[PDB]
Design a protein around this ligand. Structure first.
Ligand SMILES: OC[C@@H]1O[C@@H](O)[C@@H](O)[C@H]1O
Ligand SMILES: OC[C@@H]1O[C@@H](O)[C@@H](O)[C@H]1O
Ligand SMILES: OC[C@@H]1O[C@@H](O)[C@@H](O)[C@H]1O
Ligand SMILES: OC[C@@H]1O[C@@H](O)[C@@H](O)[C@H]1O
Ligand code: NI
Ligand code: NI
Ligand code: NI
Ligand code: NI
Ligand code: NI
Ligand code: NI
Ligand code: NI
Ligand code: NI
Lengths: 388, 388, 388, 388
């Protein structure tokens, strides 16, 4: 009825999102840089809960130890002044030329050691600022050509790096967990761990798998043509959805990072339905870029729209699930039977059950319609607010 | 020099590949059906090692117990007459209308029980014929719309089904392992476990994960725009490449199942390089469809081309890796350093190493070229046989 | 407020849409065949304006001249009984095995002559039934491999065929125009004239270009990742939008033919906005397939949803364009300036205008935001009915 | 046998290709800038025929009239010193922030006038340097959202701009023609005239269509999943292939601009076959970016590989077409019949020919295999140099 966000809705934004200056591979910046303190103050006014950062967003690369302490103290004063929190942080292992062949899986061993030391330094800072999750996006881990990267050796190096970071946080006694953010390509021709599935599988080979989960991004799974709500369901089923990046993407192309709600709107509806019905309690983080057509007024408009669209879709998904006509349709399509075990009676009783094979009437079962189109049109009517 | 296959090269083909009659979603069959016995005899003449089958390829659906025994005895005589083996089998849980919403994850519980009984019946037959691997492709597990399938409940049902099949083979004492074949879409709008990564992650949640691996198909990972050699490397790293389906695909579109070598030729080269250098010893199985433009002479031509193209690429990948100029290029691009541990000295020594951070010269490291373009042009010259 | 269609809304459906039996490349039919007369009666009850057909949907292939007249007279009685019209017809040049390498561009010359005679026979029947548009979808014109089809010779053959059909209708004095329906792939690996742009360009090389336009389909341009409203705008700008096929598609994959509104919902909104604001007056034709999960009740539900979703989106697009806040936003984003000529003053005056170059303040112009994100969030609020 | 290029092979390169500094949307430059004079000298040593440029590659933006004359005179001396030619030039209407919503179709009218004056200034310079073709890539013409751009008004503005440029060159008496370069997306969410087909159709609506053709780029049509050799065939059939940009792309993703031969190798083979057999006589221009992993030695290696791979593929395509076994296969697949008119006897004789319908044996025609798989395996053997 009213779609105004409050800090209770847990909306967070990266400093690099509203602060994106608009440089793209074919053009110069269209906006001046934003001071982090200014972004914190503006986002607080719009109803945000908190902000996230890469090390190099907060502390310019090369900074002396004294300049570092000064940048952090200004930031911390803005947080104290506004009540904003810092629930997640991450490391920039992709912008500087030294990371051109990767950080953790760079072929040069000295670069891999530097990447780990740069990361550990920022984990300490994140803990100090209260973050609960530390994200890793290995944007430069990958290759443009087949012989440049032995992927088995590279996964050994990736496992080695995350194992060492797990050793580090446990030896320091820190309460922080790691989340890997997959992306299939860009800026490398193919990036390692390209989808939520590949990241979940990798984590199971780590020495302390309980410290690691995923940080999926809407547009990145869509760059592989995959269904983002399905991949989130698999991450929830595994107990590994530690954080999430929300935005929009129009299909398979360069990573657009549009505001949330833009892109595939029906997928956004089914994602919000799933997060709210599964009781996801982490931050609703927006990793988006206000288009470079916009001035600063359009940056804040686009950030506000992220939050607005989540809250509209939350309302429509809740209306859908509460509608008694929809609940009857779900039974007509046998979603209740999907949730019942196939064979709680056990293997032997299944083998002995003639009604499951010898005397199963396949033709009668085949003729039963699933009634999915009526259910989906109810979902469409709810999304569009056209119910009668 | 000569590219003639022998049974030692372990090339296998599904009965459904050369026996595809050419029916597609817009047209009728263009070829008559092939008797399985005829396919076994023809494939043996071409140098194949063996064949694979779905239950319903070998025994027509509905078959009485007596017709069943007759179909199998004819098949077995053809195997004995030719020396052909049967290393893999699988179940058809996708053609009959009863499977229109899935087999293991159908919303109707009675269909899920029937799907398990149909599978178990064919596992017994596979063991009898000597198969070592039992493949599952869940082509109908999935959805066209968001509300039709709760994916968390569906993954519970999928895990329940594979857990019961594992219970079955272990209680029977059978030496057979399972391999899941991913596909991202088609015939369902989105299929569950859509990529090698999602399947590997799922397997780790099974009660007896050691019995399950993957059966990746070249064209299916390419339908998601992903790099198939990279996904195979991840499956090999996990110890889970139990079988493989070889074919060709021209990018993101319907599943073409072209002959191996067609489609993305450079990816085929890097796949053969990887399988041969990792010492993959399972079958080289072709899951392909001779185009419906062809008569039976073109079917056998297309099957022969599958094997020929593997053997040419095997030769060119071996020439590449043996060339001393390539070995020097690999060192110039630091592939040797990629295989060395980043920090065998351990965490504490890494933290104490000033050369890894405080005194690391990032600018000097950044200026080092990786020399990947020269290496990739050596790989291209080898593939095209243009070395001088 | 109420979304009930009437024949005045001009909604039409192909006989092959609601009559699709559910056979797909991996499974058997799940529905029995529908008698055309039954489909006409049911669609009339739902508020449809008319139906369209391929020759072989109405008259089974091989039909004797006497069976033919009988099938047509039954159909015509159903049309008379219901008030349903037949505004478009088309030819099936894709199902029968003889068309496996194409109809108009088959390499065999005798098949190309047969394809033309089969087409001409149905044009006469279409005129008799009152159709105004004759569609051609060359689903089999194309190739799976490079050497199979010289595309320059094939375009000569395609032009030859359409030129002969134009000669035929003009010599007969018929008032019917042709519309080419593009599709980029499936069932051939690549289809000729794969997008609206390629079809529009081809038409300009025909001997009588005024007789030919396009029949774009939502999901087909989306199978190439393209923006369907943009391609429709280009077809309208050229004066060539003779008919349109409405449906839904979830990105780049096999042709789903979902009901209209499903798939990319925001693109559907912008398409309806464009058709209604440009005053498109032809039929709103649905080329869709009710999913094979459905029984006949779900078929009619899915057909009804096509019409419902058009009417909801029509209402929301009209509300958007009528909102004075949106009209002010359009001026803020300078859509009014886009519609003014760049240089009605002419070339010489442009060259003499120092304000266009020598004294143009580029920095001041660059700093002007375009305000597109606020406009797009107004469009989102209107679509979701969340305006306040 | 030897693959050394000479200026006779007409290979050309943009200054922006070898001079790309490696800045991408997620990272800083990895190479220093190259002086244009140095690039001309190095490319001449490698066997190139000439170079191309944007205005802003040669003359830094903002340059005073005196600095301008100096930059051009240095360049011209390098051309004279090396024998290098300048066959094409183009305008940068995409890098500066003023072009953030387009050049010719920017919503702001003053920006559209500036874009035309910037273009005309560089056409004069191109003519002075001897260029024959002037390319336009409208990289910023397009939109991220639906309401931001009325595409019909934008195409009016695009036509207005190209009509004025045609007026300009004709009134000046210049012998130069224009070529539009399509791209479907990036950096805008959708770009206008996204494919070769849309550009060819647009040109037919210009006032003097004979002055305009296309400049297709391999990777751009592949970003839409389309077959680049087919689109080139359509451009050749229309008489509109005025220039071509050669490079490589691995499927549907961001524009990679890899060296020619990388990406889809079989498509490169069929493209070279087509250009050489159609007798394309324009420049073989490489629009590529040496990956940012490389130092300057890798830049020159990658440029050399462009030329090498064209010359290898030229040899293999010529061997294919000259092989008598291939010529017999082409007849077996009836490529000779494809080139014969379908009905040179005319419409009336076709209607009177009972052998084309009443007495056509469709079943006999349908059973004829097309023998395309054998032909395609001959093409594969030739490409890989595996003929015996
Ligand atoms: O730019 C690095 C930020 O961190 C990750 O979330 C990325 O997706 C990206 O937006
Ligand atoms: O048709 C079912 C066969 O089994 C699986 O390997 C599928 O990919 C398919 O080719
Ligand atoms: O099946 C042939 C019908 O005619 C065309 O409109 C196609 O898109 C299709 O739906
Ligand atoms: O960067 C602008 C150059 O000109 C055009 O050819 C583009 O494709 C591009 O490489
Ligand atoms: Ni992103
Ligand atoms: Ni992100
Ligand atoms: Ni396949
Ligand atoms: Ni397979
Ligand atoms: Ni379609
Ligand atoms: Ni259609
Ligand atoms: Ni490009
Ligand atoms: Ni280009």
């Amino acid at each position: 009825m009213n779609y105004q966000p409050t800090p209770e809705d847990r909306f967070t934004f990266g400093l690099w999102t509203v602060g994106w200056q608009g440089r793209d591979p074919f053009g110069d910046a269209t906006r001046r840089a934003l001071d982090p303190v200014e972004s914190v103050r503006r986002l607080a006014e719009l109803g945000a809960h908190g902000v996230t950062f890469h090390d190099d967003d907060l502390i310019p690369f090369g900074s002396s130890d004294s300049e570092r302490e000064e940048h952090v103290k200004r930031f911390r004063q803005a947080l104290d002044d506004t009540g904003m929190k810092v629930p997640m942080a991450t490391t920039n292992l992709f912008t500087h030329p030294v990371f051109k062949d990767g950080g953790f899986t760079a072929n040069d061993r000295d670069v891999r050691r530097y990447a780990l030391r740069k990361t550990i330094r920022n984990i300490d800072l994140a803990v100090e600022l209260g973050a609960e999750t530390y994200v890793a996006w290995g944007g430069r881990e990958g290759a443009e050509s087949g012989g440049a990267k032995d992927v088995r050796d590279a996964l050994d190096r990736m496992k080695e790096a995350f194992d060492l970071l797990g050793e580090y946080v446990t030896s320091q006694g820190y309460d922080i967990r790691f989340a890997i953010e997959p992306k299939p390509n860009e800026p490398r021709g193919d990036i390692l761990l390209p989808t939520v599935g590949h990241a979940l599988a990798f984590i199971e080979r780590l020495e302390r798998p309980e410290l690691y989960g995923v940080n999926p991004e809407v547009g990145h799974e869509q760059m592989a043509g995959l269904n983002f709500p399905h991949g989130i369901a698999q991450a929830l089923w595994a107990g590994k959805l530690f954080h999430i990046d929300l935005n929009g993407q129009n299909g398979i192309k360069y990573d657009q990072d549009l505001r949330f709600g833009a892109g595939d709107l029906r997928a956004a509806f089914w994602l919000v339905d799933l997060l709210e019905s599964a009781g996801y309690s982490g931050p609703r983080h927006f990793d988006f870029k206000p288009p470079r057509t916009e001035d600063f007024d359009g940056v804040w408009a686009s950030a506000a729209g992220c939050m607005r669209n989540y809250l509209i879709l939350k309302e429509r998904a809740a209306a859908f699930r509460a509608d008694p006509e929809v609940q009857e349709a779900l039974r007509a399509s046998r979603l209740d039977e999907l949730a019942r075990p196939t064979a709680a009676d056990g293997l032997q009783a299944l083998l002995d059950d003639r009604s499951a094979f010898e005397e199963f009437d396949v033709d009668a079962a085949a003729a039963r319609g699933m009634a999915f189109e009526r259910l989906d049109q109810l979902a469409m009517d709810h999304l569009l607010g056209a119910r009668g």
